[PDB]
Design an enzyme around this catalytic site. Structure first.
Site, short mmCIF file in Angstrom:
data_model
loop_
_atom_site.label_atom_id
_atom_site.label_comp_id
_atom_site.label_asym_id
_atom_site.label_seq_id
_atom_site.Cartn_x
_atom_site.Cartn_y
_atom_site.Cartn_z
N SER A 24 0.82 -1.20 0.00
CA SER A 24 0.00 0.00 0.00
C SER A 24 0.87 1.27 0.00
O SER A 24 1.64 1.49 -0.95
CB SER A 24 -0.95 -0.04 1.19
N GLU A 69 -9.20 -3.81 -4.83
CA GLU A 69 -8.48 -2.79 -4.05
C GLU A 69 -9.38 -1.70 -3.50
O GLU A 69 -9.28 -1.34 -2.33
CB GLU A 69 -7.41 -2.10 -4.92
N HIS A 89 -8.34 -4.73 -0.34
CA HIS A 89 -7.06 -4.07 -0.16
C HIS A 89 -6.41 -4.49 1.16
O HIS A 89 -7.05 -4.44 2.21
CB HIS A 89 -7.25 -2.54 -0.21
C1 LIG Z 1 -11.78 10.20 -4.72
C2 LIG Z 1 -10.54 10.69 -4.28
C3 LIG Z 1 -9.39 10.60 -5.33
C4 LIG Z 1 -9.19 9.13 -5.75
C5 LIG Z 1 -7.78 8.82 -5.46
C6 LIG Z 1 -6.70 9.45 -6.20
C7 LIG Z 1 -5.28 9.34 -5.86
C8 LIG Z 1 -4.99 8.46 -4.71
C9 LIG Z 1 -3.74 8.83 -4.04
C10 LIG Z 1 -3.08 7.99 -3.03
C11 LIG Z 1 -3.63 6.68 -2.64
C12 LIG Z 1 -2.65 6.09 -1.61
C13 LIG Z 1 -3.30 5.11 -0.61
C14 LIG Z 1 -2.19 4.59 0.22
C15 LIG Z 1 -2.58 3.63 1.27
C16 LIG Z 1 -4.04 3.43 1.47
C17 LIG Z 1 -4.49 3.41 2.88
C18 LIG Z 1 -4.73 2.07 3.69
O1 LIG Z 1 -5.85 2.01 4.10
O2 LIG Z 1 -4.22 1.32 3.93
C19 LIG Z 1 -4.03 0.21 4.75
C20 LIG Z 1 -3.02 -0.68 4.22
C21 LIG Z 1 -2.76 -1.86 5.04
C22 LIG Z 1 -2.60 -1.61 6.68
C23 LIG Z 1 -1.04 -1.40 6.98
C24 LIG Z 1 -3.37 -0.33 7.26
C25 LIG Z 1 -3.69 -0.18 8.42
C26 LIG Z 1 -3.39 -1.20 9.46
C27 LIG Z 1 -2.94 -2.58 8.96
C28 LIG Z 1 -3.56 -3.76 9.84
C29 LIG Z 1 -3.47 -3.79 11.36
C30 LIG Z 1 -3.89 -5.19 11.51
C31 LIG Z 1 -4.02 -6.05 10.25
C32 LIG Z 1 -3.75 -7.54 10.34
C33 LIG Z 1 -3.88 -8.28 9.06
C34 LIG Z 1 -4.54 -8.14 11.48
C35 LIG Z 1 -4.46 -9.58 11.83
C36 LIG Z 1 -5.66 -10.38 11.49
C37 LIG Z 1 -5.92 -11.76 12.06
C38 LIG Z 1 -7.18 -12.41 11.59
C39 LIG Z 1 -4.73 -12.60 12.28
C40 LIG Z 1 -3.13 -5.14 9.35
C41 LIG Z 1 -1.60 -5.39 9.64
C42 LIG Z 1 -3.50 -5.28 7.88
C43 LIG Z 1 -2.81 -4.22 6.95
C44 LIG Z 1 -3.17 -2.72 7.39
C45 LIG Z 1 -3.72 0.76 6.17
#
Ligand SMILES: CCCCC/C=C\C/C=C\CCCCCCCC(=O)O[C@H]1CC[C@@]2(C)C(=CC[C@H]3[C@@H]4CC[C@H]([C@H](C)CCCC(C)C)[C@@]4(C)CC[C@@H]32)C1
Ligand SMILES: *[C@@H]1O[C@H](CO)[C@@H](O[C@@H]2O[C@H](CO)[C@@H](O)[C@H](O)[C@H]2NC(C)=O)[C@H](O)[C@H]1NC(C)=O
Ligand SMILES: *[C@@H]1O[C@H](CO)[C@@H](O)[C@H](O)[C@H]1NC(C)=O
Length: 534
Positions: A209, A341, A449
């Protein structure tokens, strides 16, 4: 008992976890506190000799994902949880957070010269830390496959603390602070990793991400110069969901808009030198101010308040243009995506229900797009609920008439077609790409995602042979095929090539396919990428 020798000669002690040896919480920079706020990080200069590193340090400050200037229960509720003592006892945060973590196979010693996989966490450039991405699964697997690797996770500043923009930041030359923290961590690895048993010439950077987009930023950083002391900082990169950041420069419209709102919320609206005023505010004031600007789960969704932006120095220009112009490091690459995603982000606009409303939302989000461009996009991504994401679910998952449509656009623009654009222009090295459909059938979300984090760090699933095995083989041999997969992974050359160019994953296993889906959408979005910049 596990000990390691740093470049300066300091000898540190770690934690023997039986299944691995960890050295957690090693500081790599001076605390970016007070007058060092928003500034480039400063290499740590003290002595660590004799100190023990047995636990994860606190995460850098975190922005509430429901944060916004409007008042709402989602924001409030979330604040109650993050600010609660039990939460602060489990996941502690602090501005003093620039630490690096090293986890190695049991019995490793300096001189092992093992490949290194440097993990860059993701979180909307607003939340996250290395603590929630356990490396045990990846480390155990590399041992089992007889291809042991050392896992390094670097902490970096998020939200306002690491990505504040605007004219003052630009003038001062303090843009993309968070990417500079990551860059310093990479230099720390180049200088110190040998002492842990790692080989600094065999570093593969990888992230998911925002961490994946960070990997791309490191390929184009300094116009593709990835050297330090005349040697490459990394020899390969793996990108899990995300490539180019579709953003205007540090001193553009939204960079300044967010900065003005942050400063006013910080109570520095009257200072003539606002940066100085921000640097002396208390930690809580800056935290409250940050939570008063939109978080990634708020209505603004992927139109992020904090994200990397070209600064004219380290990221010299429009990222799409830099890839188009050949200004990248020459390293082999693996980049992929999850089928759906956009579904989590489409949950932020469930009040957008009519076509007129959807049009206004896109208009509001893409300030540089013309009506004609908004028109072609809405034609390429129709209201027809069978066409949207979760993909191939027919009439299922239609919470509203636009949800699946909005989800499709966001996921393509931000991750999926951005990946295709990258693969069609990147000629710096061998390319491999994957597309996961491991969770088809999951109501509302689909193959959402970040679900790959679960299969890479928490549980074993069909995707794990890619997320673990294939990635470790690539880190070790620069070829995912040495993993001994049941399906050969074909090199990717272009989206218009003859046969199958994508490794696919489903609940049962692997199979190959083509990167030729939603081409109208790709042309609507990628003909003039900048028209859709934030
Ligand atoms: C309309 C508007 C314009 C349209 C868009 C235009 C341009 C876009 C520009 C930039 C986009 C950039 C986006 C970047 C990132 C997006 C944000 C995001 O959420 O990420 C997420 C990406 C993954 C991530 C790091 C996030 C938070 C915590 C994490 C979790 C904590 C716990 C969980 C585990 C899997 C839990 C365990 C489960 C059990 C069952 C064992 C984790 C690690 C899963 C992955 C998670 C944020
Ligand atoms: C969906 O809700 C969002 C968030 O409440 C609305 O956007 C806000 O609308 C209010 C009132 O018009 C404005 O004061 C805010 O500035 C808006 N916030 C943002 C971040 O845009 C939005 O209008 C609603 N959408 C629809 C189609 O009704
Ligand atoms: C950023 O770019 C400037 C200008 O070329 C350069 O001097 C500096 O070393 C770069 N920073 C990093 C962290 O590479």
């Amino acid at each position: 008992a596990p000990t390691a020798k740093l470049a300066n000669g300091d000898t540190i002690t770690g934690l023997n976890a039986i299944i691995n040896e960890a050295f957690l919480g090693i500081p790599f920079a001076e605390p970016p506190v007070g007058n060092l706020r928003f500034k480039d990080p400063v290499p740590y200069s003290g002595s660590l000799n004799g100190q023990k590193f047995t636990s994860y340090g606190p995460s850098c400050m975190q922005q509430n994902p429901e944060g916004t200037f409007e008042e709402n229960l989602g924001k409030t509720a979330l604040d109650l949880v993050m600010q609660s003592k039990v939460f602060q006892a489990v996941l502690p945060q602090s501005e003093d957070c620039l630490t690096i973590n090293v986890v190695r196979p049991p019995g490793t010693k300096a001189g092992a010269n093992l490949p290194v996989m440097l993990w860059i966490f993701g979180g909307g450039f607003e939340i996250g830390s290395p603590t929630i991405f356990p490396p045990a699964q990846m480390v155990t697997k590399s041992v089992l496959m007889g291809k042991p690797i050392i896992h390094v996770a670097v902490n970096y500043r998020v939200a306002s603390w690491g990505f504040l923009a605007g004219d003052d930041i630009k003038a001062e030359g303090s843009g993309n602070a968070g990417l500079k923290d990551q860059r310093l961590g990479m230099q720390w690895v180049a200088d110190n990793i040998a002492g842990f048993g790692g080989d600094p010439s065999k570093v593969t950077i990888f992230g998911e991400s925002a961490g994946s987009m960070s990997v791309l930023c490191h390929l184009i950083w300094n116009d593709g110069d990835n050297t330090y002391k005349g040697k490459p900082l990394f020899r390969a990169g793996i990108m899990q969901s995300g490539a180019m950041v579709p953003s205007d420069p540090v001193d553009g419209t939204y960079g300044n808009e967010i900065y003005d709102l942050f400063v006013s919320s910080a109570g520095c609206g009257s200072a003539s030198d606002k940066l100085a005023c921000l640097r002396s505010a208390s930690s809580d004031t800056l935290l409250d101010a940050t939570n008063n600007t939109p978080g990634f789960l708020a209505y603004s969704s992927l139109r992020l308040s904090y994200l990397p932006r070209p600064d004219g120095k380290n990221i010299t220009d429009d990222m799409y243009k830099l890839v188009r112009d050949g200004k990248y490091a020459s390293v082999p690459v693996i980049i992929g995506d999850q089928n759906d995603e956009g579904t989590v982000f489409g949950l932020s606009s469930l009040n957008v229900t009519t076509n007129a409303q959807a049009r206004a939302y896109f208009k509001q989000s893409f300030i540089h797009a013309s009506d004609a461009e908004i028109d072609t996009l809405m034609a390429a991504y129709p209201q027809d609920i069978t066409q949207g994401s979760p993909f191939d679910t027919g009439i299922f998952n239609a919470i509203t008439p636009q949800f699946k449509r909005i989800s499709a656009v966001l996921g393509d623009l931000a991750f999926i077609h951005a990946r295709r654009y990258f693969l069609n222009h990147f000629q710096g090295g061998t390319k491999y790409s994957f597309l996961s459909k491991q969770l088809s059938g999951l109501p509302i979300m689909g193959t959402f995602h970040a679900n790959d984090i679960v299969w890479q760090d928490y549980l074993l699933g069909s995707g794990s042979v890619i997320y673990n095995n294939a990635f470790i083989a690539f880190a070790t041999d620069l070829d995912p095929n040495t993993a001994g997969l049941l399906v050969n992974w074909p090199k990717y050359t272009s989206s218009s090539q003859s046969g199958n160019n994508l490794m696919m994953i489903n609940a049962l296993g692997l199979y190959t396919g083509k990167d030729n889906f939603r081409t109208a959408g790709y042309d609507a979005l990628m003909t003039n990428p900048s028209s859709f910049f934030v």
